[PDB]
Amino acid sequence: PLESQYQVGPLLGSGGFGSVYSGIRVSDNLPVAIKHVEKDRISDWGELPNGTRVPMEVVLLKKVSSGFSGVIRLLDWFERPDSFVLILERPEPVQDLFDFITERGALQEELARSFFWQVLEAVRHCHNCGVLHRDIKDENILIDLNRGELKLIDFGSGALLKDTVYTDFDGTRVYSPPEWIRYHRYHGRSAAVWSLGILLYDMVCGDIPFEHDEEIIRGQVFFRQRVSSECQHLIRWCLALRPSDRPTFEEIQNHPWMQDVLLPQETAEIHLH
Ligand SMILES: CC(C)(C)Nc1nnc(-c2ccc3[nH]cc(-c4nccc(C5CC5)n4)c3c2)o1
């Protein structure tokens, strides 16, 4: 099944719950990415329409797959005795937003606006299709350098979206909201908005605002870089301590800092080429 259909490049990276290889489909030469998940390391098992037990990442990616390219395409998946293999789209040339920010330091605001807008569009699409990612960060965002288009990746910490409380959490501590640190309780939308504020701060400052649990709970945001007041306001709003004080996605995208956003293609010519 697999060996025939795909040629395997080197490793692209690995985290908890996954290892990802660069790869090529032999039939069309289409660039792919090949993700392997060990069954013994899966803490959160999903179920398909078929009534078949597979990793949650597969459930979530199937639920969001259609014309929309702000989320990574799941092309195919396989089961093996001890593992699962996911075939995912791979743009070329591409670069991880974590590496991209590392290289450039603070992003100019025009570029941050485009990037953050596209992530917001992506996350809205996820919620629309019933999916909550739970690990929004620079590491889980890819830049298609030719098209200036961003893509959410790694739904291995994700869950079905629900409007009731979540008591489990598998994503990145430093990106997690204060309600999780203190009460091991949160709600999806409000918690995602927090992690997006961490993301925006990362984009405009070159680094994340908080390292320890104590700083997260204090919720005081210091800017080490020149950032506009409109941008500051938005970040501080997303990073409100009390979830109900956080903006909704509509209110984020209607904020004054998010006006006159560049199209992706414009974003590439000015900022990436
Ligand atoms: C832990 C991590 C980020 C490796 N998990 C992950 N899960 N899926 C991917 C994933 C899926 C499709 C992809 N297509 C292209 C990449 C890729 N390209 C360049 C650099 C990177 C590194 C962060 C992994 N990924 C890709 C990754 O990564």
**3-state SS record for 26-79:** CCCCCEEEEEEEEHHHCCCEEECCCCCEEEHHHHHHHHHCCCCCCECCEEEEEE
Question: What CATH number does residue 164 fall under?
Answer: 1.10.510.10
Mark whether 117 and 149 lie in a shared domain: yes
Give nearest CA residue, ligand 1 atom 17: 12
Sign of CA dihedral 143, 251, 225, 191: negative
Sign of CA dihedral 6, 11, 13, 15: positive
Quote the CA–CA distance of 75 and 139 in Å, as a whole number. 21
Mark whether 154 and 66 lie in a shared domain: no
Give nearest CA residue, ligand 1 atom 5: 154
Q: What angle do CA 85, 90, 96 make, to 5 degrees?
A: 105
Quote the CA–CA distance of 89 and 250 in Å, as a whole number. 29
Q: What angle do CA 98, 102, 108 make, to 5 degrees?
A: 95
Q: Write down which residue in 71, 92, 113 finishes a domain.
A: 92
Mark whether 173 and 60 lie in a shared domain: no
Quote the CA–CA distance of 62 and 131 in Å, as a whole number. 10
Which experimental technique did the depositors report for determining this structure?
X-ray
Token pair listed for 20: 């990802």
Contact 220, 186 (CB under 8 A): no
Q: Write down which residue in 70, 92, 114 finishes a domain.
A: 92
Mark whether 226 and 173 lie in a shared domain: yes
129 phi/psi in degrees, rounded to 5: -95, 15
CA–CA distances in Å: residue 148 to residues 51, 68, 102, 142: 39, 15, 18, 10
In which residue are the tokens 């489990």 written?
A: 168
Q: How far is the CA of 49 from the centre of ligand 1 (A)?
A: 27
Residue type, 170: D
Mark whether 127 and 219 lie in a shared domain: yes
Mark whether 10 and 135 lie in a shared domain: no
Q: How far is the CA of 95 from the centre of ligand 1 (A)?
A: 9
Mark whether 108 and 63 lie in a shared domain: no
Contact 21, 33 (CB under 8 A): yes
Contact 58, 46 (CB under 8 A): yes
Please pick, among 135, 138, 144, 202, the residue that the annotation labels catalytic: 135
Q: How far is CA 240 from the centre of its chain?
A: 21
Mark whether 98 and 212 lie in a shared domain: yes
Quote the CA–CA distance of 179 and 23 in Å, as a whole number. 40
Which has the closest alpha carbon to 193: 139, 157, 241?
241
Number of domains in the chain: 2
Deposited resolution, Å: 2.7
**Binding-site annotation: residue ranges:** 12-20, 35, 89, 96
* Cα distance between the two ends of the chain: 39
Quote the CA–CA distance of 129 and 60 in Å, as a whole number. 9
Mark whether 52 and 112 lie in a shared domain: no
Mark whether 145 and 107 lie in a shared domain: yes
Mark whether 2 and 56 lie in a shared domain: yes
How many residues does the structure list for the chain?
273
Distant-in-sequence, close-in-space partners of 85: CB < 8 Å, separation ≥ 6: 2, 34, 35, 36, 37, 77, 78
Question: What CATH number does residue 65 fall under?
Answer: 3.30.200.20
Quote the CA–CA distance of 200 and 189 in Å, as a whole number. 16
Q: Which range marks the domain in which residue 206 is found?
A: 93-273
53-55/74-79 β-pairing: unpaired
Contact 198, 209 (CB under 8 A): yes
Q: Which value, to the nearest 10 degrees, does the dihedral of the CA atoms of residues 217, 218, 223, 228 take? A: 90
Give nearest CA residue, ligand 1 atom 25: 12
**Binding-site annotation: residue ranges for ATP:** 12-20, 35, 89, 96
- Residues having CB closer than 6 A to ligand 1 are 12-15, 18, 20, 33, 35, 72, 88, 90, 94, 96, 139-140, 142, 153-154
User: CB neighbours (10 Å) of residue 71?
Assistant: 25
Q: What is the 3-state secondary structure (H, E, C) of 156-223?
A: CCCEECCCCCECCCCCCHHHCCHHHHHHCCECHHHHHHHHHHHHHHHHHHCCCCCCCHHHHHHCCCCC
Quote the CA–CA distance of 215 and 153 in Å, as a whole number. 27
Mark whether 252 and 214 lie in a shared domain: yes
Which has the closest alpha carbon to 140: 40, 12, 8, 10?
12
261 phi/psi in degrees, rounded to 5: -75, 145
Q: How far is CA 103 from the centre of its chain?
A: 19
Q: Write down which residue in 44, 66, 92 finishes a domain.
A: 92
Distant-in-sequence, close-in-space partners of 173: CB < 8 Å, separation ≥ 6: 213
**135 catalytic residue (yes or no):** yes
